[PDB]
Write a protein that binds this ligand. Structure first.
Ligand SMILES: Nc1ncnc2c1ncn2[C@@H]1O[C@H](COP(=O)(O)OP(=O)(O)O)[C@@H](O)[C@H]1O
Ligand SMILES: Nc1ncnc2c1ncn2[C@@H]1O[C@H](COP(=O)(O)OP(=O)(O)O)[C@@H](O)[C@H]1O
Ligand SMILES: Nc1ncnc2c1ncn2[C@@H]1O[C@H](COP(=O)(O)OP(=O)(O)O)[C@@H](O)[C@H]1O
Ligand SMILES: Nc1ncnc2c1ncn2[C@@H]1O[C@H](COP(=O)(O)OP(=O)(O)O)[C@@H](O)[C@H]1O
Ligand SMILES: [Mg+2]
Ligand SMILES: [Mg+2]
Ligand SMILES: [Mg+2]
Ligand SMILES: [Mg+2]
Lengths: 527, 538, 191, 541, 78
């Protein structure tokens, strides 16, 4: 009846598919997040340390924020990918607190360890944190004071909040000069339409970072330059900027036109018609007096010798993102027809000068007060100093990006976490149930942000935190820790502020990161 | 159930275990089907060593070819165990278990239970035991009919060897068996009858010797070869040197004392030789006409052989345990171990003692006894397989004829026993029996399985097996009404029936009894088994 | 196993119609729609079909840009010929380019004089055959002694195009696979 | 007695074929082996269920506590499990609700029938028993209905419909996600005094646009849609025109070229001079007619050329690619226009209306928002999800797909009436079937009783996930049904659940009639197939 | 053989394999008894022709012109 000697049993899952039951896997998932958490533990704070990562392709990448550190390390574990997703989400939405949101997410998982060791299943502890966030977000809104009541100046607001962003970086001593760059850069943008692509920074080598300069114009980097370059004047007084999407090339990318002729006299006409058409396009541009011609697609060789004669500047092979930044500065839009041009579409600038830095040449527009864009030429010693300072000012721009939309001041230095925690402790004592110990653990998890500020500074943490617990018994606000005077005090007197969106999205993202892998008990991996 | 327990195993159950026992049975049956009968085919067995051994015995085929199947090893032990005590009926057990399984398996496919089928074989077996009492015939041994023993000897010898070897080797067995019967009527096969190998002129020159033949002779040339009247002496004492239980050095001091102590080696031997000389002085009369021979079970020192050679005493050393237990039966003397107490009564008698040698070996012949109580069968042969073929033929022939003298009955063969049980089981009233229910086919299955044996004899002759039973069936239909008790047979020469009473074909009593009993037990146990498996530590 | 695959793999759109009466419609028409789509892709890729007698300024575009094609990595093979009219092998290779151009319309066939190609090129090394693909030189071939020399044939040139990955092995246009109609006629009669 | 004879049917079917018939023990091998995956769907059941992370061979990680999404990716070698796999997929594609009951009720019928097969009851009789028990179950569910709804238009009435469905998946978010789904359905349904004759509804009406970052409370409803796309050419006016006519062209805006390939042929140089202006005047004749009627937005599916884009920039016409064909027709439903592969000219009847189009960043990426106010819409809506992780937003999408699939399950048939949930009607069916088994004497009565015992897992699985003792609240719940008030008894999930009694109407937990009928039928048909098979034949790899 | 049976008729494949298995079983029972296969197959053909002379008398004729639904249902149910 049977087909053969024996019949081995079937494994239900595929051969090699890992699976496990019980409380061991969720503890392993929590320990996996804590293992990723320990890498970013000493990074938190102004006195924190950077992290050096080298991937398989052997490209050095130094960073301080946890957004790109987790992007470099390709994470296999799904539970450890939760910290990476919120870090990119925090980087995409706000742009600040990418390290603290991962530390708070792991600390809630760390404080959930002994409750999971108890018989309480994960559906109780999820309800406690989810109930606590509903009061924490409201308490941050109640502690948010408005700036217009004092009738202060608007220029000093951006400088005050951007000073906090330049901590824990290479800039904190040179922040007196570079904070004016990003504040004046973002103010040139339109308040209604604030764009993230108009703040592109070129990774130009050479030079010290303090030698940079902020200009309302935009640069592009010299392009291919067929013979013709270094004959035109590289300095103009009031040049007219022109942009053309049409490809000025003698049938380079055009489709192959099958020309068929049957006469010798017409062969002289058809070969001169190529010269006749291309010169008609040059003469039409010549009549308008366009002193600076630009194009995304390449410029022909004959045009360079023609524009070199009448001191007309030309450049091609510009990218779409860089060319879009030019149009926001120089006014009129792009036209791809030489006959449909108009004087009114041309731009203008009060000064123009080409100067070399780092053995590279960059054309710089100058004197453009009507420009709704900006540029930054960060120069730096190595290549990672440029990239680190690049993403640092991108985070500084991200603070003033969101500060203009909504103007809310909140405490800093770990103070906002403690006023929220002690309020939840006052709310927890009236519960008298299982949710009391959970909310007290949520209050203990918010205390961790003051810890790493003190651990990286070298001072003992248990003594100073007990001093704050004695200080927060009475009514007090903007009470945290500082490092200059080596003694705690009023942060408002010390003049340090932050936005409220950083703390709100951090608590929601950290609790959502916690509830994702506390609402599971198994991780199956095929293959 | 076995795969999750054992990570590696094999399991057959409920259809393959039944097919295995039947397929292995039909496979092993086809091997020994052609050998059964007088016109069967011979079968040689050559291993990797290259030696050759030829015989038709199923035991030699089974106990020399290694077998892997779990069913056949039980058929091997069953075929071997039945033959090891009885000496006949080896292939008959294989054919019964080889046929009874396939004949019952057709009804297992129909859906009959194995338990009630084997219940029918057991109650049918009891009917055959009751039928053996009526089927057998009484024979009185006081007549001492030598022609009756000749016909029994040709039954087994014609099956193994041809008529040329049967006619010359038949009276060799009859003369050996004629001396077995005595007043005490105690049968003795292993001690009395023996077989010895000897490469000589041909197998046809096998002769019967009434006395005990020995495979050794006189070492020295001067010792006598032929002796007319030799009085034997049995001594189990060892007359060479003995190392003496921890005894160590003959600490000699001077050179003269060295050889003086070396001469004491002879004193222990000469103390025993003097008792033989004192015994020879009593029987010293007619010394040239008469003689004396000494047979020792252990070795004799070569220094002492010259003592026997001077007195013309024949010396034979290193005899077997069995030969010392046979000299009293042949020569009529008595055995002795120690040399202290001797007498002339223990000495035997022999009428002729001579030696003949070929190549390097030498044989001693003893014969012409006054009243020999035992004898030997010295078989001649050409090749080693010729001796092995004569070994199995004489081993199976002596056991078959010896069992006739044990009891007072004998069973005629040639299919008379199987054909008689067929009509008995198929015509007997079932109300007399205690079996009911689905035992209808169990009687028919075992009754029909017995018919395949006598036609297997026909399958070797080439005739049609179903047609040569037509007149056999018609004979028994009229024999019951004709008022004449006769038993039919199966003659393969002409392809017609015969009478084993006048032709001389016979079979022993305990062969067919133990065969069906051993076959029914093995076949029943194989049917009830419904699962095969292998498991263990290795 | 291959007997089931030979019904579809070893028959073009013209040969697949033979199995319309024998094989199932859904089994056959499912593959004919697949092969019909492949034929349409080759028609869109047929941007060439005659030898492009170019000059140098243009080389920097025709030879190399083309090799990038769409840059969907739509690469395009570009066979260059540094012609030299004094050599006998050059005129033979020019005939092979025009013959292959009429068949393989997707592959670009480029020709230029060798004296105008490289400054002071060795005349002994001409004729030269270069094969560009995605801007990279796949093969820098030397004079045609490898391809038989003076006795070079069209069959040898088509075999070289298969080695560099320009044409598939089982292409119906290759003379090795394009059996004559009289050849297939004898096979059906003797079958 | 060392090597076996090797099963002399080995000349028959090859070694790769494995037979696992009965008598040998197939039923015992199967019902058991599948208990591992039965516990997977059992642990993921209820509002407190645990989601399961499934990493496929490609590496796309998913985390979903359903059953259809999990078993689709699990490569399962066991054939008897696969009967339960695609049987659950039938519930997903047809009704979109009840995947879990099916994987649980179908497996429990095999688990509870261990007593019938082990006692020695015939397999053929068990199939006849569950079939007759299935018929009695379908007839009896109609009598226990108390939620006969006839309005099915207003938003507050859907609180008894959508919120029980959303309360199962991620119980913590009820009011927020129910507001998004309920407000989406109100935008989908048209404004009318009496809409009848089975109005059309489809799952493709309500779409889900996933945006990275942002708390779940900051989400909002959009009547149009939102694409991750870069606008080109200009900035919008956003209040000046007050309304915009949007033309959707299947073919691109370019000179009409044929399918067969052509090229440019010029016999003389006179045509060479006019060819540069001929292409400009050709499109100008076709582009000027579009601007006369005031089409302030054009949507071309294929790639738009630069010559066509240049003429549109000066007039201030919005352009958009929309390469995929499925999402191209959904934009037409918003404006209320038809596709036009012909260029032609814009007509007033075929052109729709759109209030405004504005561009911003929601999660850092620039997107195009087609939100309109005071306009007429028909079967179109979107829900902008804000979340911390992409892994969590994937589960919100399927939860919304199951929510709107229930709307398809209501409006497509004539009645999608409610039933008491939270372990209320399941225990009632145990009492009905217990009384039904005594009415019909016969050997099949044992099958009728064991069919009722399989419904026990529904109440206790909510208690097991709640960390409660099954032997206390489950027998205490039977005492509450002794005797309307006894019908609305259910399983409580709270710290005060020691009593084990909570009224259903306080929170309005309800289930669908058609969903449970289709689930019980597919569950019985799944168990019918597994109990009917006796031999299972495998193959190599 | 089952392919040719299912091709022309479409029913009775299980009867073909059982008849061939039983015919070889019942025939091999007699081949082991010393009977040649030739006369065994000769008896099957005479038995086959005898069954056709039994089958043509065993069949029954009905009138399908009425097109009754009851007979087609029970025939289809079988
Ligand atoms: N001037 C300051 N005084 C006190 N605390 C500060 C100051 N600047 C930054 N911090 C604290 O340092 C912590 C880490 O900031 P940092 O790591 O620089 O930003 P991010 O984590 O976004 O990269 C913040 O939680 C903040 O409270
Ligand atoms: N010459 C013969 N004529 C008829 N029957 C014979 C003859 N020789 C042997 N047989 C039958 O063959 C059978 C088997 O004989 P034997 O060889 O002694 O036993 P086994 O074959 O079991 O070793 C006996 O039953 C006997 O009747
Ligand atoms: N707050 C609550 N109180 C009581 N029962 C609840 C609550 N929330 C959800 N439930 C119950 O949890 C069950 C989950 O069922 P589910 O498997 O999601 O349905 P389906 O199988 O149709 O998708 C529902 O039947 C519901 O009655
Ligand atoms: N309900 C029934 N009762 C008794 N015999 C039946 C029944 N149905 C079919 N059979 C028998 O089974 C045989 C084969 O029928 P069927 O199973 O339909 O064909 P196949 O064996 O090729 O699948 C027929 O000869 C018929 O006699
Ligand atoms: Mg920061
Ligand atoms: Mg014998
Ligand atoms: Mg549901
Ligand atoms: Mg049938």
């Amino acid at each position: 009846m049977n087909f053969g000697s024996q019949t081995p049993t079937i494994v239900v899952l595929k051969e090699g598919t890992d699976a496990s039951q019980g409380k061991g896997q969720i503890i392993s998932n929590i320990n996996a997040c804590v293992a990723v958490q320990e890498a970013l533990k000493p990074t938190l704070g102004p006195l924190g340390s950077d992290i050096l990562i080298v991937t398989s392709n052997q490209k050095t990448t130094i960073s301080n924020d946890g957004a790109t550190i987790l992007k470099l390390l390709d994470v296999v574990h799904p539970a450890a990918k939760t910290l990476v997703d919120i870090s990119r989400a925090q980087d995409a939405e706000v742009g600040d607190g990418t390290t603290s949101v991962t530390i708070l997410a792991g600390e809630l998982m760390k404080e959930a360890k002994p409750f999971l060791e108890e018989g309480i299943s994960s559906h109780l502890i999820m309800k406690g944190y989810r109930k606590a966030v509903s009061l924490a977000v409201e308490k941050i809104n109640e502690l948010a004071v408005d700036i217009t009541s004092e009738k202060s100046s608007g220029r000093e607001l951006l400088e005050r909040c951007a000073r906090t962003a330049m901590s824990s970086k290479l800039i904190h001593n040179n922040a007196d000069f570079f904070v004016k760059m990003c504040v004046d850069a973002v103010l040139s943008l339109d308040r209604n339409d604030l764009d993230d692509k108009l703040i592109g920074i070129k990774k130009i080598p050479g030079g010290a970072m303090e030698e940079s300069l902020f200009i309302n114009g935009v640069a592009f980097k010299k392009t291919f330059s067929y013979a013709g370059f270094e004959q035109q004047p590289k300095k103009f007084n009031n040049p007219k900027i022109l942009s053309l999407n049409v490809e000025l090339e003698l049938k380079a990318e055009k489709d192959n036109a099958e020309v068929r002729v049957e006469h010798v006299e017409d062969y002289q006409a058809i070969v001169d018609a190529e010269w006749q058409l291309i010169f008609e396009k040059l003469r039409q541009v010549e009549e308008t007096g366009a002193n600076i011609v630009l194009s995304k697609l390449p410029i022909g060789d004959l045009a360079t010798q023609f524009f070199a004669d009448r001191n007309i500047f030309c450049a091609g092979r510009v990218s779409a993102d860089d060319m879009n930044r030019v149009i926001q500065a120089v006014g009129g839009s792009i036209q791809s027809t030489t006959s449909d041009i108009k004087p009114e579409h041309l731009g203008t600038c009060a000064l123009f000068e080409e100067m070399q830095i780092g053995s590279e040449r960059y054309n710089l527009f100058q004197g453009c007060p009507q420009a709704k864009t900006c540029t930054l030429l960060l120069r730096g010693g190595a290549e990672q100093v440029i990239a680190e300072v690049e993403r640092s000012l991108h985070d500084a721009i991200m603070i003033v990006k969101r500060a203009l939309q909504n103007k809310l001041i909140v405490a800093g230095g770990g103070a906002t976490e403690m006023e929220v925690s002690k309020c939840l402790r006052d709310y927890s004592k009236t519960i008298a149930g299982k949710q009391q110990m959970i909310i007290n653990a949520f209050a203990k998890a918010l205390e961790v942000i003051p810890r790493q500020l003190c651990e990286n500074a070298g001072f003992d943490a248990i003594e100073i935190l007990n001093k704050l617990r004695l200080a927060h018994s009475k009514g007090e606000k903007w009470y945290g820790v500082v490092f200059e005077t080596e003694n705690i005090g009023d942060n408002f007197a010390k003049f340090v502020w932050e936005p409220a969106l950083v703390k709100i999205n951090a608590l929601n993202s950290a609790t959502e990161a916690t509830n994702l892998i506390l609402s599971v008990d198994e991780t199956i991996t095929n293959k | 159930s076995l795969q999750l327990l054992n990570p590696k195993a094999e399991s057959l159950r409920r259809d393959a275990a039944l097919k295995v026992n039947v397929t292995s049975a039909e496979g092993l049956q086809s091997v020994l089907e052609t050998n059964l009968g007088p016109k069967g085919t011979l079968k040689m067995l050559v291993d990797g060593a290259g030696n050759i051994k030829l015989t038709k015995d199923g035991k030699v085929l089974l106990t020399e070819m290694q077998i892997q199947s779990p069913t056949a090893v039980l058929i091997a032990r069953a075929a071997a165990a039945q033959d090891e005590i009885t000496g006949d009926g080896t292939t008959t057990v294989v054919c019964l278990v080889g046929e009874l399984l396939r004949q019952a398996h057709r009804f297992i496919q129909e859906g009959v239970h194995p338990r009630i089928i084997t219940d029918g074989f057991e109650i049918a077996r009891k009917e055959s035991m009751k039928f053996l009492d009526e089927f057998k015939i009484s024979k009185t041994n006081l007549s001492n009919d030598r022609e009756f023993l000749l016909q029994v000897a040709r039954s087994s010898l014609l099956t193994k060897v041809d008529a040329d070897l049967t006619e010359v080797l038949t009276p060799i067995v009859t003369d050996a068996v004629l001396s077995v019967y005595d007043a005490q009527a105690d049968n003795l096969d292993l001690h009395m009858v023996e077989i010895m190998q000897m490469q000589h002129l041909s197998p046809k020159d096998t002769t019967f010797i009434k006395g005990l033949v020995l495979d050794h002779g006189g070492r020295h040339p001067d010792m006598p070869t032929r002796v007319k009247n030799a009085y034997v002496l049995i001594l189990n004492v060892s007359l060479e040197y003995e190392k003496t239980e921890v005894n160590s050095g003959f600490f000699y001091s001077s050179a003269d004392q060295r050889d003086k102590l070396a001469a004491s080696e002879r004193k222990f031997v000469d103390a025993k030789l003097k008792k033989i000389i004192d015994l020879k002085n009593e029987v010293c009369g007619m010394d040239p006409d008469k003689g004396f021979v000494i047979i020792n079970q252990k070795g004799i020192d070569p220094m002492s052989l010259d003592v026997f050679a001077k007195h013309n005493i024949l010396a034979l050393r290193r005899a077997k345990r069995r030969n010392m237990e046979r000299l009293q039966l042949v020569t009529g003397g008595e055995a002795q171990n120690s040399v202290e107490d001797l007498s002339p009564q223990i000495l035997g008698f022999s009428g002729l003692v001579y030696q003949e040698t070929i190549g390097e070996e030498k044989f001693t012949y003893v014969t012409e006894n006054t009243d020999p109580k035992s004898c030997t069968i010295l078989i001649k042969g050409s090749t080693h397989y010729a001796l092995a073929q004569t070994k199995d033929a004489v081993r199976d022939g002596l056991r078959a004829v010896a069992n006739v003298l044990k009891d007072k009955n004998i069973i005629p063969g040639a299919g008379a026993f199987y054909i008689a049980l067929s009509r008995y089981l198929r015509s007997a009233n079932m109300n007399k029996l205690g079996a009911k229910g689905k035992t209808k086919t169990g009687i028919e299955a075992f009754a029909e399985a017995l018919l395949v044996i006598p036609k297997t004899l026909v399958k070797n002759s080439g005739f049609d097996p179903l047609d040569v039973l037509a007149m056999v069936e018609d004979e028994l239909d009229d024999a019951q009404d004709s008022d004449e008790t006769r038993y039919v047979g199966v003659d393969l020469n002409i392809g017609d029936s015969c009478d084993p009473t006048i032709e001389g074909i016979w079979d022993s009593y305990r062969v067919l009894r133990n065969a069906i009993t051993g076959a029914t037990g093995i076949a029943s146990n194989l049917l009830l088994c419904d699962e095969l498996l292998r498991a263990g530590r290795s | 196993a291959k007997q089931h695959e030979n019904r579809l793999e070893d028959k073009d759109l013209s040969d697949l119609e033979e199995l319309e009466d024998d094989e199932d419609e859904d089994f056959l028409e499912a593959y004919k729609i697949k092969r019909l789509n492949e034929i349409r892709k080759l028609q869109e890729r047929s941007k060439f079909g005659e030898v492009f007698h170019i000059n140098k300024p243009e080389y920097n575009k025709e030879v190399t840009l083309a090799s990038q094609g769409k840059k969907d990595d739509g690469g395009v093979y570009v066979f260059v010929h540094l012609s030299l009219q004094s050599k006998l092998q050059s005129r033979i290779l020019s005939h092979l380019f025009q013959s292959a151009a009429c068949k393989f319309r997707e592959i670009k066939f480029v020709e230029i004089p060798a004296n105008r190609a490289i400054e002071n090129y060795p005349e002994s090394n001409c004729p030269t055959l270069i094969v560009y693909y995605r801007g990279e030189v796949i093969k820098n071939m030397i004079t045609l002694l490898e391809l038989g020399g003076n006795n070079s044939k069209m069959e040898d040139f088509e075999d070289f195009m298969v080695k560099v990955g320009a044409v598939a092995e089982g292409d119906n246009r290759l003379i090795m696979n394009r059996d004559d109609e009289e050849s297939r006629e004898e096979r059906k009669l003797h079958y | 007695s060392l090597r076996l004879p090797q099963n002399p049917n080995a000349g028959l079917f090859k070694q790769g074929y494995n037979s696992y018939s009965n008598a040998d023990g197939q039923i015992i091998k199967s019902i058991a082996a599948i208990r591992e995956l039965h516990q997977m769907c059992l642990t993921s059941m209820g509002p407190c269920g645990r989601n399961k992370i499934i990493v496929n061979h490609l590496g796309k990680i998913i985390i979903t506590n359903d059953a259809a999404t999990m078993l689709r990716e699990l490569d399962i070698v066991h054939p008897a499990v696969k009967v339960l796999v695609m049987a659950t997929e039938q519930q997903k594609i047809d009704m979109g609700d009840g995947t879990n009951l099916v994987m649980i009720l179908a497996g429990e019928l095999l688990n509870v029938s261990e007593k019938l097969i082990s006692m020695g009851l015939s397999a053929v009789e068990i199939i006849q028993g569950y079939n007759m028990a299935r018929k009695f179950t379908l007839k009896e569910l109609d009598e226990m209905v108390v939620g006969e709804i006839t309005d099915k238009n207003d938003k507050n009435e859907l609180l008894k419909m959508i919120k029980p469905v959303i309360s199962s998946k991620k119980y913590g978010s009820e009011d927020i996600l129910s507001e998004l789904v309920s407000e989406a359905v109100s935008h989908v349904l048209p404004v009318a005094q009496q809409a009848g004759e089975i109005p059309y509804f489809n799952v493709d009406s309500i779409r889900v646009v996933k945006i990275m970052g942002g708390s779940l409370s900051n989400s909002t409803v959009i009547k149009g849609m939102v694409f991750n796309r870069e606008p080109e050419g200009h900035v919008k006016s956003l209040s000046e025109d007050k309304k915009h006519k949007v033309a959707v062209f299947t073919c691109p805006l370019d000179i009409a070229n044929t399918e067969t390939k052509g090229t440019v042929l010029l016999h003389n140089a006179q045509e060479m001079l006019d060819f540069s202006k001929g292409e400009e005047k050709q499109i100008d004749a076709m582009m000027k007619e579009i601007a006369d009627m005031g089409v302030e937005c054009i949507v071309a599916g294929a790639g738009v050329g630069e010559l066509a884009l240049h003429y549109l920039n000066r007039y201030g016409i919005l352009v958009l690619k929309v390469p995929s064909k499925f999402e191209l027709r959904r934009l037409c439903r918003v404006c209320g226009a038809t596709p036009l592969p012909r260029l032609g000219a814009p007509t007033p009847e075929e052109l729709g209306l759109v209030e405004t189009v504005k561009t911003m960043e929601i999660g850092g990426d620039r997107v195009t928002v087609f939100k309109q106010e005071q306009g007429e819409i028909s079967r179109t809506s979107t829900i902008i999800l804000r979340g911390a992780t992409q892994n969590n937003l994937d589960d919100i999408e399927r939860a919304i797909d199951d929510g709107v699939a229930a709307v398809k399950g209501l409006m497509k048939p004539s009645g999608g009436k409610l039933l008491p949930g939270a372990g209320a009607t399941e225990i009632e069916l145990i009492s009905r079937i217990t009384k039904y088994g005594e009415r019909t004497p016969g050997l099949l009565q044992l099958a009728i009783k064991q069919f009722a015992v399989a419904f026990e897992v529904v109440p206790r699985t909510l208690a097991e996930t709640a960390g409660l003792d099954v032997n206390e609240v489950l027998p205490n719940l039977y005492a509450a049904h002794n005797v309307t008030d006894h019908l609305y008894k259910g399983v409580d999930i709270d710290g005060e659940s020691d009593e084990g009694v909570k009224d259903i109407r306080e929170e309005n937990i309800y289930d669908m009639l058609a969903t449970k009928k289709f689930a019980i039928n597919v569950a019985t048909e799944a168990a019918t197939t597994v109990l009917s098979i006796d031999q299972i034949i495998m193959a190599k790899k």
